[PDB]
Design an enzyme around this catalytic site. Sequence first.
Site, PDB file in Angstrom:
ATOM      1  N   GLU A 212       4.191   9.159  -0.779  1.00 10.29           N
ATOM      2  CA  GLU A 212       5.493   8.652  -0.377  1.00 10.29           C
ATOM      3  C   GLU A 212       6.562   9.071  -1.377  1.00 10.29           C
ATOM      4  OE1 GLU A 212       5.266   7.323   2.467  1.00 10.29           O
ATOM      5  OE2 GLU A 212       3.301   6.365   2.619  1.00 10.29           O
TER       6      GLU A 212
ATOM      7  N   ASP B  79      -7.028  -4.836  11.574  1.00 12.94           N
ATOM      8  CA  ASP B  79      -6.109  -5.952  11.782  1.00 12.94           C
ATOM      9  C   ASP B  79      -6.606  -6.888  12.875  1.00 12.94           C
ATOM     10  OD1 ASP B  79      -4.596  -4.697   9.882  1.00 12.94           O
ATOM     11  OD2 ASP B  79      -3.073  -3.950  11.278  1.00 12.94           O
TER      12      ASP B  79
ATOM     13  N   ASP C 137      -3.270   5.241  -3.585  1.00 17.82           N
ATOM     14  CA  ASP C 137      -4.498   5.728  -2.973  1.00 17.82           C
ATOM     15  C   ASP C 137      -5.114   6.920  -3.695  1.00 17.82           C
ATOM     16  OD1 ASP C 137      -6.519   5.517  -1.171  1.00 17.82           O
ATOM     17  OD2 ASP C 137      -5.424   6.373   0.528  1.00 17.82           O
TER      18      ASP C 137
ATOM     19  N   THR D 153       0.833  -1.193   0.000  1.00 17.07           N
ATOM     20  CA  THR D 153       0.000   0.000   0.000  1.00 17.07           C
ATOM     21  C   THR D 153       0.871   1.248   0.000  1.00 17.07           C
ATOM     22  OG1 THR D 153      -0.142  -0.050   2.407  1.00 17.07           O
ATOM     23  CG2 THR D 153      -1.857  -1.187   1.173  1.00 17.07           C
TER      24      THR D 153
HETATM   25  C1  LIG Z   1       3.383   3.343  10.906  1.00 19.66           C
HETATM   26  C2  LIG Z   1       3.829   2.215   9.964  1.00 19.66           C
HETATM   27  C3  LIG Z   1       4.311   2.815   8.638  1.00 19.66           C
HETATM   28  N1  LIG Z   1       5.425   3.678   8.844  1.00 19.66           N
HETATM   29  C4  LIG Z   1       3.144   3.587   7.965  1.00 19.66           C
HETATM   30  O1  LIG Z   1       3.133   4.748   7.970  1.00 19.66           O
HETATM   31  N2  LIG Z   1       2.043   2.832   7.320  1.00 19.66           N
HETATM   32  C5  LIG Z   1       0.925   3.556   6.680  1.00 19.66           C
HETATM   33  C6  LIG Z   1      -0.353   3.172   7.383  1.00 19.66           C
HETATM   34  O2  LIG Z   1      -0.453   2.050   7.908  1.00 19.66           O
HETATM   35  O3  LIG Z   1      -1.307   3.979   7.440  1.00 19.66           O
HETATM   36  C7  LIG Z   1       0.812   3.179   5.215  1.00 19.66           C
HETATM   37  O4  LIG Z   1      -0.737   2.978   4.840  1.00 19.66           O
HETATM   38  C8  LIG Z   1      -0.925   3.480   3.655  1.00 19.66           C
HETATM   39  N3  LIG Z   1      -1.873   4.594   3.703  1.00 19.66           N
HETATM   40  C9  LIG Z   1      -1.703   5.560   4.588  1.00 19.66           C
HETATM   41  C10 LIG Z   1      -2.604   6.625   4.641  1.00 19.66           C
HETATM   42  C11 LIG Z   1      -3.663   6.621   3.743  1.00 19.66           C
HETATM   43  O5  LIG Z   1      -4.622   7.686   3.749  1.00 19.66           O
HETATM   44  N4  LIG Z   1      -3.778   5.626   2.882  1.00 19.66           N
HETATM   45  C12 LIG Z   1      -2.896   4.629   2.864  1.00 19.66           C
HETATM   46  O6  LIG Z   1      -3.035   3.747   2.070  1.00 19.66           O
HETATM   47  C13 LIG Z   1       0.471   3.993   3.175  1.00 19.66           C
HETATM   48  O7  LIG Z   1       1.061   3.027   2.432  1.00 19.66           O
HETATM   49  C14 LIG Z   1       1.258   4.169   4.443  1.00 19.66           C
HETATM   50  O8  LIG Z   1       2.714   3.998   4.145  1.00 19.66           O
HETATM   51  C15 LIG Z   1       4.944   1.416  10.634  1.00 19.66           C
HETATM   52  O9  LIG Z   1       5.622   0.646   9.672  1.00 19.66           O
HETATM   53  C16 LIG Z   1       4.299   0.496  11.653  1.00 19.66           C
HETATM   54  C17 LIG Z   1       4.954   0.212  12.840  1.00 19.66           C
HETATM   55  C18 LIG Z   1       4.362  -0.631  13.781  1.00 19.66           C
HETATM   56  C19 LIG Z   1       3.121  -1.147  13.464  1.00 19.66           C
HETATM   57  O10 LIG Z   1       2.460  -2.012  14.374  1.00 19.66           O
HETATM   58  C20 LIG Z   1       2.519  -0.823  12.256  1.00 19.66           C
HETATM   59  N5  LIG Z   1       3.119  -0.018  11.394  1.00 19.66           N
END
Ligand SMILES: C[C@@H]([C@H](N)C(=O)N[C@H](C(=O)O)[C@H]1O[C@@H](n2ccc(=O)[nH]c2=O)[C@H](O)[C@@H]1O)[C@H](O)c1ccc(O)cn1
Lengths: 801, 801
Positions: free
Chosen positions: B202, B457, B252, B198
Amino acid sequence: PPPSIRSCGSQQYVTSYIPTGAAFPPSSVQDMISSMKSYASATDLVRTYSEIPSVEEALSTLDRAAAALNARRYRDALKLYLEGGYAMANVAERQANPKICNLLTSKGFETLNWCARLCDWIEGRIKEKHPRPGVHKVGIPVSNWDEDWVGPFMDEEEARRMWYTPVYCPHPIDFSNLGYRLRCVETGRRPRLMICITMYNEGPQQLKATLKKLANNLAYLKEQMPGDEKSLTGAFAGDDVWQNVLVCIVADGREQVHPKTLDYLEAIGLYDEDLLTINSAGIGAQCHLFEHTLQLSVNGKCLLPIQTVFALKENKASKLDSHHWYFNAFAEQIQPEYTAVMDVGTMLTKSALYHLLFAFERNHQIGGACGQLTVDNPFENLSNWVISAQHFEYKISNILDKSLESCFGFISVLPGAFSAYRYEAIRGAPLDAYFQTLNIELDVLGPFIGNMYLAEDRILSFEVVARKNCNWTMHYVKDAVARTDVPHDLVGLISQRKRWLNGAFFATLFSIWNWGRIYSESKHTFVRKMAFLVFYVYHLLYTAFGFFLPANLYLALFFIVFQGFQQNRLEFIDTSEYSQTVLDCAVYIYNFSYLFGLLMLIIIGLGNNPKHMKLTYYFVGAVFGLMMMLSSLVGAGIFFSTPATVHSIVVSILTVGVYFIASALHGEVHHIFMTFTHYTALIPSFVNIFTIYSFCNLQDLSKGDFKDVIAKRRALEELRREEKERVENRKKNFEAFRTNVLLTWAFSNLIFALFVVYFASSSTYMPVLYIFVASLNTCRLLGSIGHWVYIHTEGLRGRVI
Amino acid sequence: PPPSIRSCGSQQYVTSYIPTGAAFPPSSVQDMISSMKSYASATDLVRTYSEIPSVEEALSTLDRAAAALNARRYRDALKLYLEGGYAMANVAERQANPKICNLLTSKGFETLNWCARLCDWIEGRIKEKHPRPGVHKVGIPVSNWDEDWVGPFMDEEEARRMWYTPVYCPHPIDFSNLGYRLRCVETGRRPRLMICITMYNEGPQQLKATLKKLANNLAYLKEQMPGDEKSLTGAFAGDDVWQNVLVCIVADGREQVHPKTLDYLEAIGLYDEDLLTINSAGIGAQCHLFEHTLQLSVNGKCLLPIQTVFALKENKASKLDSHHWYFNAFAEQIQPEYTAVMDVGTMLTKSALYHLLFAFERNHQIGGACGQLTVDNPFENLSNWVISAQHFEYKISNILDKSLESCFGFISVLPGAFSAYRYEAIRGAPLDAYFQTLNIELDVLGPFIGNMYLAEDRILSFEVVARKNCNWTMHYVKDAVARTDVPHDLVGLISQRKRWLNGAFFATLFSIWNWGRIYSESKHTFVRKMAFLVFYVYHLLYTAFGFFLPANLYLALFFIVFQGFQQNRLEFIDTSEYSQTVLDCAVYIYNFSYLFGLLMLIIIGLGNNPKHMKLTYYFVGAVFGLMMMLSSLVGAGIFFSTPATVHSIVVSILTVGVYFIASALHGEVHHIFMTFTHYTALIPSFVNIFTIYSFCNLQDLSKGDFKDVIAKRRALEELRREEKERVENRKKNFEAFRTNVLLTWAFSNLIFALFVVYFASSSTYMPVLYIFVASLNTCRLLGSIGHWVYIHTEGLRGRVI
Ligand SMILES: C[C@@H]([C@H](N)C(=O)N[C@H](C(=O)O)[C@H]1O[C@@H](n2ccc(=O)[nH]c2=O)[C@H](O)[C@@H]1O)[C@H](O)c1ccc(O)cn1
Ligand SMILES: C[C@@H]([C@H](N)C(=O)N[C@H](C(=O)O)[C@H]1O[C@@H](n2ccc(=O)[nH]c2=O)[C@H](O)[C@@H]1O)[C@H](O)c1ccc(O)cn1
């Protein structure tokens, strides 16, 4: 080389490879195009379907033409305009309704003439800037005409024809330059008084009542006796007053207007949907204005004609936008003498207009005036506590504060419902500063000016007084009574008071900041400047006292009642008995209840809208009201148990009895007797809940090739992203400002209360509070007495000076 | 009778009266129309201008045709489609760019064929439901092709051609029914593993790093030695693994995608703007999907090919929508075995995929798995306190909680970044409950289910375990290490943690509510059910303890430090001296500072976004951190001054040393030594700030005549008003729910703290807290030891059973 793609759109799924080589070879596409015969059948079907036009298609094409014209693309606009004009001309014959046929024919001819003019402009024959479709107003007979209606004299054209025109004027200052005219100017009439009735999402009954009251006022003015000292003379004489008065009804948007209101307006001949739909097809007007001389009949009595202009805005904006349109366009064109502003539902007495005009004509130093505002049917349904509390608040505020401020000739806030000005003291700078928000983006102004939202009345009132090279003073007329409608529930009052409190606080800060302009720039008498200085000192003291009101209320209640119970200072009972547990229990219960209530109130107020938290607000208000009633009873018992002294009686008089003394002086005493208890039961609710909700929700406010196409898309995306970033930054700044102000206020109050409750005793603190309250109420009583003396003496004593 | 309206649109202002009589007489309009010659000149100019078409006009007409088709109006759609097709066919010859010419010609032919099919459908020859333009995917050569690239074996068609198609599928379940196909299915390849990445807003570097890491994992899988006990066999063997893996990159929205990301994607041959603009003109597609087998080169080393499908959504929705598209469409079509989900920027080690696949293949009772999540470069820039605190939190949470929950075979939350499932245990009901929000409006579900936002999740994890007629258990793999990137500032962490905390709380409540489904519906062993019951009891106790955490932290700090100072209970110093003023001053200062800090935090959190309140959050965090460090030093001094006892040493071990014991058992002890102080300095900040901000901002979430025209306008207005009312009511309900929850939490904590601080002493309260903490940490340590024993024993002991 073309692949086998003859059947690609018809089949459900086709995969093809399109090579980028040296372009497709010629003479091959021609065979592929000419080998298909289904295209002929499709073209035949399309031609058959497109032979007959439709009204909806013509209107849509004209709307697209207007949108293209607003984008400054002229060839596409010309093509679409020609298509729409021809379509409407063809359709007009088919329609059977005579009115629809006539309107369609006229619109088609007008569109074709505009097409010719635009073609000439494109060729260069006509040299103009920003050409637009020519202004064309249409008069049509009114559907309902009262045969049984007796009036002074009405021309058939004026009596039976209603006029309509759409206006595109983006900046209302340019209304007269673009060529728009009103019926009054065309007919040669020159009205001297203008009344604006702002409307938004209102029922028919309120508008009907307002119009009936205005007609009654005009009737009273007509029947004025001639040859008297108290009679108006000149443009406001009898039998011809109705020709010198114009009523402008400004609506805030078609989407939010109640449909029954539109039905009622159409009934009295002031709105027609078919004409609006047809004649506004290609103009893309910002507003639609209808004009009529309406005739109203109530029961068996026929009222006087009212020259009415109904201006309906296409989109929705603030009430300040309605005032912008009204003042700028209509005032700058008509150029009247006076200008009255009122809301919808404000029912006036018979003598309101007479008193306002009499004050304006006789005194002549007045740049603005306001009448008394009352609650409709206060005695009826007396069991309701909120209505009685509001009635008491209105009466006391009017008498004391309005009289005190009118003695010095500076009213802090004109109500905005039933106020009046003269269009000589506000024409220039005061109106420019009035509409500063509408002309400058909030980014440049800053958070302080922007948060002065819905405080516009105070801005205009102060700008009138401190105008350079002029000496205009405001005045308060007691006899001009206007009755409004008030909310019947606590949640409605809480929702309503937020705007008032935000505007009051920030406009008061602005006035305190800029009070020096009166001495630096204006041209007043020395005596007036000294009086303004005295009023400035009083205003500073009053505002400072009002800033620390929750802490003072808490300290007074705590000390008097609960430390009199704990430390044996109640006089009607002795607490030297008891097991030392109840004595501390009273104070602990009071402190815990007060703190928990304040925490709940601040959480709710900062959190959510006060519409789904009805039960919790009611519960907190009930708790505070019971506490206040108990405290009042205990204090009354304490006062009556004391054998009384000169100091005690003087303090009691100058603290509480000022209300009764002033009310009896002005003759409005029975209302105070009826509503004193109801107002007393809601003091802590008022202070705490309204101030907290006001501070918490302060944030609320308002030809080309492929490469050219790609560049256009990228430019649009970049502009949209920059706009979004700017809006986000603006909201961030305003949220920060409101949070800082709320934190400062709450922490100042808490620190003051704690420091005074730990390092000071009741005996060394209560006398100071008594002195402060007595001083403020003495000043207010002196102001009220002075105003009464003026209003009862100057009329007789004007002969001397 | 027509008036003199020949010159009405040309003149600036014209007034006309249009009588409604019996319609205009005939034979008069004909003379007026025929007497004007400017219309001929206007028509000549329009015809001259309209002779030459343009690309932009053709694209706009096709877009209008698509909009009309979506409105189920077919004749207008057919006319507009024919106009656009003819315009594009004419334009194609003029363009000089070969690719543009070929694309325009192909699009014109496809549009004309679709016009023919639509005409046949209208005539009734073709009987179909909801006809749409036929699916047509286009393959074009990639602009950049690496001549110097050595790979296993690549067909020229696969190596040099990138494929594109626009998809209109509104419900992703119908992706296979509408006729859309992927290149893997067409080529006959049947991938067994799918990875979803996803993406939203970025930079190019994160995507480049993620792709490089995936290529390294594939390379490690390829080089796996054959003929070993620990080597994977079958579809994941060497030299052919890359054909069994597919990577789906879901974006997205085009508006929010960083332009440099699009440039990088175009560089590797996965995006082309011209093809997207041309081929998506009339389809009105919901999504655009590009397909390629990308080849990546880093430094002098050439990586393995990756079968990539890049799906870009036209509009913006949530990440749950991206999962909806990925799972439903691609999984239901391809039907793989495993399904891995990760975010963009999650850099994997070489052995992550090998360990996940090894666990899945060997154990076979696993319906889902998750690897260890680490902070990239923890030791580097050690001076930053937030990064070190996050590193400590991640390590401790992983070890203790993941091991304890993996012993029972039920992991509470899979991270969602680098997790995996098998597409046999989630195909039916678990995915249906996963996407319940996307299929049912939030009005029907209610506030409880809606506020379970970003908690998806946990919903999927619980639905896998409790599935009817199945026994699927989850597992935690320690050796699958994935390194993420964490915010470097306090404000970023505060913004990030809100979603986590809201989801955790409400999903935990849901799991506690529905835990009975495991026994009532599922089919597990009796031993598993008893173990789940034990884990349920532990989960209830842990959640109940975590609900009252701020009160317990305040009570512990207050009692120990400040009442040891006041009442002479510190052992390393005696306070029988001093003038009785400092003794009370310490407690008063502590209470006032704590209360003021909490009030400021709640006001800020409920008020505004934590981006412009950086300084205040930093100040509050610094105050709490200094307080916690001082308290920790005082407690350490107290503990070391006591001559020690069996009870004291046992409590100290089971309270604090469990972290060090477990970390040394699992070999990750140096990180704990480095980051223990940094995590200790932020405990009150963590608890108070994060919980308060999570609870305060819980509201955040996602032919006809004239009469027919009037009816259409009225219907549109009524529908718009009803929609607005429904949205307002929904927001009202959710605000009410969040406010009620926050009030309950805050008042429960306050009441508990007050009652325990007034009616209880330190000697009669501290032992209970010590026992509770010791019990919880003992259970966690036992869980970690059990997990280590399993992971080091079952591999050898699987031969026995
Ligand atoms: C925080 C996370 C990572 N740094 C992150 O930021 N993930 C985003 C998220 O989970 O929101 C990704 O979600 C997608 N996204 C976001 C916004 C939107 O409006 N639409 C959309 O698709 C994007 O790809 C975005 O990169 C990190 O790895 C982590 C650490 C511990 C844990 O337990 C879980 N995660
Ligand atoms: C409250 C007031 C009256 N009951 C009222 O409600 N006035 C509205 C207002 O002032 O907002 C009117 O303003 C217009 N309006 C409103 C919303 C909008 O979005 N646009 C818009 O134009 C509407 O005409 C609306 O009736 C009452 O009389 C009063 C008492 C004491 C006082 O010191 C001042 N006023």
